Amino acid sequence: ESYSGVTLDPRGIYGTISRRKEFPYRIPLDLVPKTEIKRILSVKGLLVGEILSAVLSQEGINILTHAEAELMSVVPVFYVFHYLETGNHWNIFHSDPLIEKQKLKKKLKEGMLSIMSYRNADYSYSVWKGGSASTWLTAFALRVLGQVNKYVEQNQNSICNSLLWLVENYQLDNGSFKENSQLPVEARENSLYLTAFTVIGIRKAFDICPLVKIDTALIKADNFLLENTLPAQSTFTLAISAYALSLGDKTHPQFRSIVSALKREALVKGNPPIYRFWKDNLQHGTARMVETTAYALLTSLNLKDINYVNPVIKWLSEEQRYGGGFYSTQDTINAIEGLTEYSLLVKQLRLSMDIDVSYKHKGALHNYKMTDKNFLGRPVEVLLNDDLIVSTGFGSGLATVHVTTVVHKTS
Amino acid sequence: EDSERRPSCDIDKPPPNIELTGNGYNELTGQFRNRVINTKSFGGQCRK
């Protein structure tokens, strides 16, 4: 009887962090007299991530410093800096990385001043002089500020009340979201689009300002999205709803049904599929499907599936975009974030785990050193009767340990 | 010998003197020259 087995997760990729696991030693009541329980332990080393393609350049030279589109100009700089920090690649240029990092920090400070200039007295976010209030740009700026939160600083009090404003005003009792600044099903489609956008924004801005009211708003919005995404309305709406739901709970039944429907609505080219994309219009500056492809890529990256992400990465690397996207940068920052998450998940699968399995009240039995060349482990017999505890250090990768229990039972 | 697939699809006459147009040309003397571009060929694609 195997009866036991776990996957050691160093950095907590799938669900919660799992590094130390205790396998208790039990003796069944059917044990044969004068019989010793034998256990064998080993590791698998499931797989590694694909380093197929990841390219991003010429953005710093073309558009770094060059009316109302100052936000549109300064926003992608944050995502470019995030991608450069994640990829850890600065030796491509002849200049020193420190000078470029300081220049990018100065540009990020300028962008923070610019986004502070767009803040009205009501703590809302508007585009043209603050005449009308718009929730779309508000959630966009919330995304930008959540991206900034990870690097330098952001005032929490200015974000908590900003989220409370939306929760109080723009949150429908059903869970929908709308905006003040301005085919019956098109209204519901736009409502679900705005709701998914606000869900993405609030989930990005939630990790820095945890609140019970914000959690209630997130629960209500997730319920709205899970209830109203049952019919197949549009590929773009389905993808943005799937991403907004994947930013939160990733193992919901209706969320998995939506993910399965989106995978069924996917478009492939070749057998096996080399390129995977999503088309909004059925049987149809002209490339509008890039947005839904980027949203589906982000959704798949939230599920940590390398085999399903690779074709979308190959599609977004080179295709008929040319490109080829909207707003911009509604899709440009999404594609940058997708490439960043792809590179980050590739870095996650390094298999640097150092497994040291030991007994609870006795000495250590064996120690495994997992590397890229040695992705397998030698079986070790467990003779002495004691509780067995498998643990590892920090590590980086993904591996599962297998341990079976061989016991003579009469019979 | 056994030429199947209807060779030349019963196309008989080419343009009268296309060889004169295909022939070379001189600018300082104003007189035509020898043929350079072989327009008598067909490449198999019969164009009636």
Added chain:
Amino acid sequence: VQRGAKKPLERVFQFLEKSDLGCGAGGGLNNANVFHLAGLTFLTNANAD
């Protein structure tokens, strides 16, 4: 028994014969085909492969 239990190796030259690139005994069509069947590729002005 082992369905006969033939031998440990029993084959040193038969498995070494796999180094031959071409197949068949020999002979064939025009020089290109016979050289491809023999496991070679020629470079000459007259004919191509």
Added chain:
Amino acid sequence: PGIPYPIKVQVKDSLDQLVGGVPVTLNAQTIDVNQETSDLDPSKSVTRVDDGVASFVLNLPSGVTVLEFNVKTDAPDLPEENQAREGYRAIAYSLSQSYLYIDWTDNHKALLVGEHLNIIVTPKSPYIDKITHYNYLILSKGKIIHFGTREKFSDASYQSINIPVTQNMVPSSRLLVYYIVTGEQTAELVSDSVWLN
């Protein structure tokens, strides 16, 4: 064409094992390149238990292009309805009408190391009566171990070349003999190769 072509056929059982002591015969039709053909006389022989391969030899005229042979088994117990027959076709070698051939088809049988072997070559119907030189290359394991060269004289129509065998050619080998000619407009070389056991 014109040279007797040996035919070596093997009979295997249902599961990957040779069979011996089964008489077999074949029917061949030597076709002419110019006009109608005639049926070649059949030949019947038995397969040896130690060798496992049946030996046949057929002589054909010089004006044959292809041949088809239907090797069938002959046994007192095997009926005509339930019989084993396998048809095949053999195509001969050319724009310059030149040919080349190497003989003895490894029926020595297979040779050892240290003894010199002679092989007869024949440039039947060349482009010109005068040939520059003879060129032949022996290869093994996908590599060229040695390259040979000989001269052509008018002493005879066929010349025998001597090829020394080495220790590097024990498992198997291949040899190819090609000669180049000088045409009036374009050149064309003819080659040929036969297995080496």
Added chain:
Amino acid sequence: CEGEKRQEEDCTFSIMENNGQPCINDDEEMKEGCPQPVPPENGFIRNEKQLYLVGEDVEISCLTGFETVGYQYFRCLPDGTWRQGDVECQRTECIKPVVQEVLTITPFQRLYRIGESIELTCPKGFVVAGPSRYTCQGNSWTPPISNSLTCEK
């Protein structure tokens, strides 16, 4: 003269990645070792693929709200069958019901542990009959889904 004096076109140069000129087809379609196994109750197979290699073992997890008990691993047999080890899913927390938007159900949380009772009402006027206070013990909640409450005046 007749015509236009101004031509306003688009430019953002959003395509930063440069790999090479690709070649494109005409149109695509939706859909053209051990196969994808049939999971146990609640499914939730991770790293879903079309075909699994021989000898590869994939771990299955329980869908929320449940918990993996026993041996949760599916190893590819040499033939097309699977091992199907002993595994089950026991409910650890109950989820919030999606019956109707009128609740505002007390208490309002994401998940509830076994032993906690929940109460739903129809504010602010009349109320609907049925079970007002019901707890989740992990016993496969069976509330109505179409005519759950539908509180009438």
Added chain:
Amino acid sequence: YVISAPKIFRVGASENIVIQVYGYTAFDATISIKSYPDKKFSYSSGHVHLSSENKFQNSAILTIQPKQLPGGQNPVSYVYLEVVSKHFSKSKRMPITYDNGFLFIHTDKPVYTPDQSVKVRVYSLNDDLKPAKRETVLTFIDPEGEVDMVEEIDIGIISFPDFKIPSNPRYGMWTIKAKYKEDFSTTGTAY
């Protein structure tokens, strides 16, 4: 100018390339091995000499060493073969394969019992029957579908440590594969 070469070249092997000339009343020739970049790479460069004594034919050995670009979508970049001569010049691609050498896995016994040592040795060989001392990894696969992997640096006869049967063996036909694990092909299989 007839140039005879093998159809499939072998990486890390001596491939003899011969050239013949129609004959004239003594010009040198030069052949080189270039990668997929034309422009701008070259593996090796061989030179021959033509005279009346050699009758204007000569053969030079060429090698394909691990000069290929690390990583990439495909490490093949088969070959670009060029000939530098006074009277002629031509280029042609030829497919290659990392299939080099042979692996003869020799086991002491075809039948094993639980808790028994596994004495096994691997015979590394080149195309020219030379030992070709190279590192080799050995993997074990359970009959139901991998068990343990071990690598050892190579004498000509690669000695491996004695493997041990687990406490819960799986009866059946096991599998033994051996690879060089750095850059090579022609994986050997033992049962």
Added chain:
Amino acid sequence: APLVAFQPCIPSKLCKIEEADCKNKFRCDSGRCIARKLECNGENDCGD
């Protein structure tokens, strides 16, 4: 003088992405891709 003059190049990459254009239609010998319905209709639709 010629407007644009092209010369031999040193290509870093040779031809690629070469495949059959016709998927559900007939492929003529000259490169034209016509529907299979137009085959065996007593009319030269390919041109050769």
Added chain:
Amino acid sequence: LLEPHCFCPSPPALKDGFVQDEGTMFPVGKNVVYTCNEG
């Protein structure tokens, strides 16, 4: 570079080793193989 087709000295060998190919001058790009003695 003229439509193609229109040095290093003897390398030293380490202790207990010898070079397979010996020559006065070797063209640029040519590779040499090193070998070891008996034992």
